[PDB]
């Protein structure tokens, strides 16, 4: 501060940020190359948001495209946060009390908390002043941070794809604000004698983001257009017949019952929702159409398919035999055996797993679909609860005609529910390749800790204890990951888990089914499952003291 | 007002998920304050309404928990395990035993909801209401 | 009332749990005691005789009977209806 | 005939509970 | 006001030429300028003055076998100012 101005030794040290200028140069070169190859149009601008001369936590890159609507300028911005590992932000301190002693907890600050209302206000004012329009309206298009520990010198493809996607998002938000024809399933008939088919898939390698961020995905549900006519030409050649893709994985939760209902309940978590690669448009009415595919995974209990053991290898991280540790027998059920097969795998699932699953979503305010995750988070609960629900109902009505009131009543029925759970987002480098941090779940922790139930119970309470403070839960979760996974964990963000309403999913599915949407797709005896429906409730009908005392009332 | 209550256990006839035993609460005495010298029928129902309030925090199960230091062995709750899956009795008065698994025992062997009963007496102090209820 | 070693107590202290504690493992005797209370087939006089014998067997020789009482069960819906009616009638009671 | 238990006590059971008086950070939204 | 923050480390400190330096305890001095309506949330202006790297070592006094057998000696390795101060 004033010490440097008080002594004034010749020469300058530090006092600069070097992960912004290089990124700006790279982005300018990429934009020039893309414009040269007739890939984009010279109608957008790239600007730098320096932290030094704006006094903000993190520098950012903003991509602004402006149009004119009825004489009123409109500017759309897609900020890109640029976290740096060379500087440390001050931590947040919290105090908790235990008996007669008080202590201080040093938390950590994520990217999400940096992007506050004041940050966006300063960014909008800076953009308005730079572009020469002081009173122009500014609309957000969805932030997307660039993860640290990424070398920009050899990552040109990811940056190029991110820039094109950002331009597409700006165009999408501008078109939505201007007002265009909504996307409806009535226009999907094609009037050419084709049908829509849904294909399920079981995967073992994680999916990848546009910047190489791994995403856990065990079950993948896709929707395609099947146009197989009689003498179909183009053998072995396919014309982009694919529309949607949803990545899902199942997790087990244990209900608190002391020891006929199964002890464990299976909950399915939706991680990523996206459209086809060929489709360059993203509109709100496609999101619900893509999300409707999640419910179709229960057609043949396909959510249990990843649980069955694979033949030849055993990673011992997702083993299902650990479920027997707390069963009636203390030991674990031994898979990988000649006798073990699907014959009693179904018996085990019937006797220890509830038949019906639970649907959950990992909403993220900083992901690719931030503009919908934020809306759903607002609809879950807060000051803006009625407006978000009304907007969602209006969008669902716009997708597929109307008359959604016959199946759902948003006035007296919650849409989304918040479970009060915060999930860290990170990646750990396995021996073979980089993986996702969310691979560690209840089953993984149970496998890691063979017989010590108390440690596992402590881990389980470290996730959803309502009494314990959230900072302590985050500390315990960060310690357990280090204990089990390894030393290569690198956190990147935060996410929140929410539970959909049970009736909402069924109502949405029935509404889409009734709206003219038709989707087609795809042993030892155990007993009579239909004899129990017919049972006599009544009993055969055949003809076949009380001493009292004085009462003043009567 | 003042209402005196005590709980008793009844066993449903089921051969061997529902708990085997059901807790029934018996109301013995209902009375007003000592200072109040008036007794009217409409005060009796107002006083009796306090009986239902004992289930606000499962307060009817509080006397069941073991006391520290003494054991009369007349109201011991460990005898409930005699007919359980294990023949022997659960041993209280131990260092490991506490409220941590007392709740587990009550969940696994006692129905969550109680039953309300009254011991009407035609010759007691409140005879004029006991006779009417009889 | 039966006179305990310290002070006089109440005869109703003997309940199902007390009988179960007194008879450690013999289930048949306890079941006989339980049937001596609410068997509908058996005559009431025999039930009173068995109950008077069991009290002498367990409690002591100081039992002194004074009267009779009858047990009744309130309707489940009646209590809830009464509570809701009083609550809606402007009565507010607060506690832990 | 031997007694087995009370088959009528389970019909009367209280369903309710005694009635006594006794964050959400947000961000910018383009929709509103 | 001036505040001193203690720190426990496990990775060695580095010299200006990459030479590692052992440092288990780090003591720093900062300027705390938190006023009422402080602006610049999440932004800090170089509030740090000094830094001292220390680590402890045990020495045994020569007594044959109430005083403890071992005595702890703290060794100061590096003393330096803040990066901003030139």
Numbering used by the authors:
A (entry chain D): 48 to 306, 319 to 581, 590 to 611, 622 to 631
B (entry chain A): 291 to 306, 319 to 436
C (entry chain A): 486 to 581
D (entry chain G): 590 to 611, 622 to 631
E (entry chain M): 242 to 306, 319 to 339
Sentences from the paper on this structure:
In response, one family of large bacteriophages uses a nucleus-like compartment to protect its replicating genomes by excluding host defence factors. Here we find that the bacteriophage nuclear shell assembles primarily from one protein, which we name chimallin (ChmA). Combining cryo-electron tomography of nuclear shells in bacteriophage-infected cells and cryo-electron microscopy of a minimal chimallin compartment in vitro, we show that chimallin self-assembles as a flexible sheet into closed micrometre-scale compartments. We find that the shell is primarily composed of a single protein, chimallin, which self-assembles through its extended N and C termini into a closed compartment.
Size-exclusion chromatography coupled to multi-angle light scattering (SEC–MALS) of purified chimallin indicated a mixture of oligomeric states including monomers, well-defined assemblies of approximately 1.2 MDa, and larger heterogeneous species ranging from 4 to 13 MDa (mean of 6.9 MDa). Cryo-ET of the largest species revealed pleomorphic, closed compartments with near-identical morphology to the phage nuclear shell that we observe in situ. Analysis of the smaller, more defined assemblies by cryo-ET revealed a near-homogeneous population of cubic assemblies with a diameter of around 22 nm, and a minor population of rectangular assemblies with dimensions of approximately 22 × 33.5 nm. Two-dimensional class averages revealed that each cubic particle consists of six chimallin tetramers (24 protomers, 1.67 MDa) arranged to form a minimal closed compartment with apparent octahedral (O, 432) symmetry. Three-dimensional reconstruction of the cubic particles with enforced O symmetry resulted in an approximately 4.4 Å-resolution density map with distorted features, probably arising from the inherent plasticity of these assemblies breaking symmetry. Using the maps for the tetrameric face and full cubic assembly, we built models for the higher-order chimallin oligomers to understand the subunit interconnectivity. CTS1 extends from one protomer to a neighbouring protomer positioned anticlockwise around the three-fold symmetry axis of the cube, and CTS2 further extends anticlockwise to the third subunit around the same axis. Although the linkers between the C-terminal domain and CTS1 (residues 582–589) and between CTS1 and CTS2 (residues 612–621) are unresolved in our maps, we could confidently infer the path of each protomer’s C terminus within the cubic assembly. Compared with the tightly packed chimallin tetramers mediated by the well-ordered NTS region, the length and flexibility of the linkers between the chimallin C-terminal domain, CTS1 and CTS2 suggest that flexible inter-tetramer packing enables chimallin to assemble into structures ranging from a flat sheet to the observed cubic assembly.
